């Protein structure tokens, strides 16, 4: 997708849209700099830069370094996606929200919109907490002179992240509306890459000072190239199966199913469940157990990593085991005359399928699990240890690039 992406840029609507993205991107990396009107921005970070606030290690990353400096993007674009599972939990027990969502796309707007106002409320609670226990409780520790560690500062910060999480939210709602694609995804992936950056040029003047080297900085990055040149073939992998038809338009061609059909959705939600049990225990610097449950799950430490391996694997499988694709499929193979060789309809169409997603998402998400483990072993082996290179923020360095040059092509194959 290297010579074509260039000639895809030679199309003045496809080309156009990738700039309005920049317009936000800029303003977004801009929002990525903005302190709090009362936090000694100057007294917020390296508490968060510690094996004690660096447990905040994950929030800084996805938000985009924004958390440490405590920017208006501090929490980033979080408090809309931890309402994307509780809602994905309010989607199957409430057997009408899809019926709303699927009888036209204008029944998932309400979904999106209630998710958004809640997505403003949550981001008014996750700040309602980092104040009540962290910045405040200590005194004028993190804070400006004169300002009160009480309600008025607590109020100059609530609006700092509610037009600060509302802003990053919006950045998705206006790129998606009139620019290109999904402002989301994009907005998380950039937040890792900008944190996967200056450490590199720390490294060269270090490969000058003594500080690591060319060959530890060969093996760490050729790994990054083994990541580009594998995941893709894998994303475009599949098992092709014979069928036939007998004696009114449409398709008669063959029908393959992807080893793994989405590398993203199952890995994102996976990062998600990885969060709640850390950020619930993270703001208690005194109780020794909560300070255990926050450093264990630390996905940059061999055990949290092991739990990071896990959650990224099995979330692939079981989200590779939810949505209504096989049912959709089974019906259009039904009104129009199609069938599989030797295979019956009813129950041995159940267990002939129950065999396959028990054969594919085994070697599959294994990959994604091993995909999650080794950069920490790398960070137990090489020359850098930062929460960025916890192996989570390259997965998508890959991913985003891919699905883009995987849906742009899908956009061109329509005109």
């Amino acid at each position: 997708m290297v010579k074509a992406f260039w000639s895809a840029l030679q199309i003045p609507e496809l080309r156009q849209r990738v700039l309005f993205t920049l317009l936000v991107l800029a303003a977004y990396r801009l929002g990525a700099f903005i302190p709090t009107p009362g936090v000694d921005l100057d007294k917020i970070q390296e508490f968060l830069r510690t094996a004690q606030g660096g447990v905040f290690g994950i929030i800084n990353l996805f938000s985009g370094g924004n958390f440490e400096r405590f920017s208006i993007f501090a929490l980033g674009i979080m408090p809309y996606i931890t309402a994307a599972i509780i809602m994905q939990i309010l989607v199957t027990v409430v057997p009408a929200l899809e019926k709303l969502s699927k009888e036209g796309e204008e029944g998932r707007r309400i979904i999106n919109q209630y998710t958004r106002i809640g997505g403003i409320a949550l981001g008014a609670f996750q700040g309602f907490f980092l104040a009540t226990a962290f910045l405040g409780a200590e005194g004028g520790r993190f804070l400006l002179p004169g300002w009160s560690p009480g309600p008025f500062f607590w109020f100059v910060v609530v609006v700092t992240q509610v037009a600060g999480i509302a802003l990053l939210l919006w950045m998705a709602e206006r790129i998606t509306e009139y620019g290109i694609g999904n402002g989301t995804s994009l907005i998380i992936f950039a937040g890792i890459v900008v944190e996967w950056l200056p450490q590199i040029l720390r490294t060269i003047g270090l490969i000058r000072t003594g500080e690591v080297n060319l060959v530890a900085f060969l093996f760490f990055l050729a790994f990054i190239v083994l990541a580009f040149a594998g995941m893709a073939a894998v994303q475009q992998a599949e098992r092709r199966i014979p069928v036939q038809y007998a004696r009114y338009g449409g398709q008669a061609t063959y029908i393959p199913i992807k080893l793994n059909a989405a590398g993203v959705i199952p890995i994102i939600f996976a990062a998600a469940i990885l969060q709640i049990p850390i950020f619930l225990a993270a703001p208690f610097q005194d109780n020794p157990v909560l300070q255990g449950i926050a450093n264990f799950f630390n996905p940059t430490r061999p055990s949290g990593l092991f739990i990071e391996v896990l959650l990224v694997i099995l979330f692939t499988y079981v989200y590779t085991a939810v949505q209504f694709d096989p049912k959709r499929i089974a019906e259009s193979l039904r009104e129009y005359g199609g069938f599989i060789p030797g295979i019956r309809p009813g129950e041995p169409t159940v267990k002939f399928l129950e065999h396959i997603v028990s054969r594919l998402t085994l070697w599959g998400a294994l990959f994604l699990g091993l995909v999650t483990l080794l950069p920490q072993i790398i960070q137990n082996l090489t020359g850098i240890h930062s929460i960025a290179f916890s192996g989570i923020g390259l997965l998508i360095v890959v991913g985003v690039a891919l699905d883009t040059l995987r849906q742009v092509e899908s956009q061109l194959m329509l005109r």
Binding site: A190, V193, A233, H355
Partner: protein, 46 residues
Amino acid sequence: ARAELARVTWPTREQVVEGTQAILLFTLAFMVILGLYDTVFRFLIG
């Protein structure tokens, strides 16, 4: 439960480099795009 990559096929096996070299120049054009921002949010203030 042990899939054989049997009747299994990929319309994709040669496009490796070409496809890889796009998962490369996409991301070797984001951080710099991200880094063009902080640098420019650094000229006016100074």
